Structure formats: structure tokens, C-alpha cells
Structure 1
Amino acid sequence: GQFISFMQEIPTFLQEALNIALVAVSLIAIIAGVVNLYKSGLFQFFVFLALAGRSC
């Protein structure tokens, strides 16, 4: 939806300090969420559920 238009219009937004700060915070938050979901074990849980006894 609005994500495609936002993707097209990003070059105009990256001229204010606040917009760059928001982009950096969003990227860092997503990366950290991925890494600590991996550390928690959710990915391992789904991988094991996919291999529900079908391998060892």
C-alpha cells in the first residue's frame, strides 16, 4: 500500500535530521529484534516444528 510510495519518496525525506534518525532507529530496532528472536529460540522452534520427527 503506502510502503511502495514511501519507498519511491524516501530520497526526498532524507534531508532532515529527524527523518534520518527515524530510519536509523527503525533499522536498528528491526535488526535487534531479529537477533534476539534468534537468541530466544523462536526460529529454532519453528524449524523443529517443520521437522516434526521427519529427520534426526
Structure 2
Amino acid sequence: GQLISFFQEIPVFLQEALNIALVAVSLIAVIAGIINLYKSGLFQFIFFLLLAGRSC
């Protein structure tokens, strides 16, 4: 509910420099964390767990 309400108010919030800065930092942080998890091997570990001894 909180996330939906926040998303419904984005145009009001996205009128100030700090809000745009925070949104950009959040998006960059999430994207880079996803990249790091992909590079570190969390996705590979999950794939191995889901298909352990069932494919080659």
C-alpha cells in the first residue's frame, strides 16, 4: 500500500532537485546491486539449486 501510494504521487515529488537525486541514486543502486549479484554468482547459485542433478 505504501509503495502504491508513493508511486501515485511521483509527479508531485519529482519537482525538486533532491527528490530526483534520490530517485536516481535508488535506481542506480538497485541496478548495480543486481549486476553485482549476477556477477558474484547468486543467480548462478539459484539456478544450480533449482536444477541440481537434473540438467547438463
Aligned length, in residue pairs: 56
Unaligned runs of 5+ in 2: none
Query: TM-score if structure 2 supplies the norm length?
Result: 0.97
- % same residue: 84
Unaligned runs of 5+ in 1: none
Segments of 4+ in structure 1 off by > 6 A?
none
Query: TM-score if structure 1 supplies the norm length?
Result: 0.97
> 2:10, 2:39 → 1: CA distance?
32
RMSD: 0.5
Shift in Å at residue 38 of structure 1? 0.4
